[PDB]
Symmetry: C2
């Protein structure tokens, strides 16, 4: 069965875990704890990876790194990437727009001067969320009636910005409805209640925002 290797955090891989649980696919996790940086560095160059990094995904057919290449491969193997160039570009554009939010947090989350950079991010965040509000005006999910990988990426981004500002969705009822819809998927519900779910941290443990061993 496939092996998914990452830090014991949400970070870059949480959307991939959510997709694997939505598809109900068997996989093994190799999790690196806060004190297992040495364990990772001594294995890193001996797994056959062409671009050694975390996370990594190893099945029969593939040895992958790059979080976007991994989530796209799992989608692609399930016929979820889109049927024609236009639909595939729509899905890649949604991907990018979600990363503008999720990388927007990560960019500033490890900085000494985080409190200053937060003011600016929370000023631009409304506009980014409005575009998703409009996309989800009459669509159950970002691509219509059927779930795609950017749904889990957006879920993860909403999870993270709600910690930084618990009122950030008060203006965005369609995003609140979308978020509850994801959570009501029976196999997502079971995952979120399971011993396998990693609630914290959001970033690397060293992060000034969404770090430490426990929520603040």
């Amino acid at each position: 069965s496939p092996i998914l290797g990452y830090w014991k955090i949400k970070g870059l891989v949480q959307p991939t875990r959510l997709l694997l649980e939505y598809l109900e696919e068997k996989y093994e996790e190799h999790l690196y704890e806060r004190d297992e940086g040495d364990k990772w560095r001594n294995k890193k160059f001996e797994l056959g990876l062409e671009f050694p990094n975390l996370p990594y995904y190893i099945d029969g057919d593939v040895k992958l790194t790059q979080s976007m290449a991994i989530i796209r491969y799992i989608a692609d193997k399930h016929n979820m990437l889109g049927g024609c160039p236009k639909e595939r570009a729509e899905i890649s554009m949604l991907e990018g727009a979600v990363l503008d939010i999720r990388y927007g947090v990560s960019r500033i989350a490890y900085s000494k001067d985080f409190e200053t950079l937060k003011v600016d991010f929370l000023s631009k965040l409304p506009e980014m969320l409005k575009m998703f509000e409009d996309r989800l005006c009459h669509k159950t999910y970002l691509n219509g009636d059927h779930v795609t990988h950017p749904d889990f990426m957006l879920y993860d981004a909403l999870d993270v910005v709600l910690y930084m500002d618990p009122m950030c969705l008060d203006a965005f009822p369609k995003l609140v409805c979308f978020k509850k819809r994801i959570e009501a998927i029976p196999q997502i519900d079971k995952y979120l209640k399971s011993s396998k779910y990693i609630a914290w941290p959001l970033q690397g443990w060293q992060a000034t925002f969404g770090g430490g061993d426990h929520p603040p």
Copy 2:
């Protein structure tokens, strides 16, 4: 014809430009100059873009933003993304590894403490480049005998890191050769010599690094 809208810099879109020139595909550029922030603010919500942003690519019915969605769409229309899930994953992985170098530069280039952040980046860069040197063992391009979009992304990343550290490819002669090989593609050489080529800046004009109006002579 397709419209490619961006700032008059290299930045996010330069690999897209190179790919269009490789394909010899006709396109028009809407180029926003340093003084045209107002021009853009005014047109931004008027173009029919679902996720308004720079760069944008407008192809009659197809209206796209996100640089990676744009370069992938152009590749996809020419059947260049990969024939099966495994080949499509190899191209996606190459794409991500190039972006770790290119975004690695962009994420510190707008910082006040660039000189401090540069030391940390240049202690990691030799190993990141080594992974590309190793991939080019017995290969003309990153995916073998045929050009793919990550080749133009790597070419762009190599141009940018050579400005930050002129010696960073001294240990990597297969990367020096790769960069010369791209520049010997005849439709690339023609573009690089033309009046359409934007040599500078690398980042937004306001950047601590790769910014301003001319390179250092």
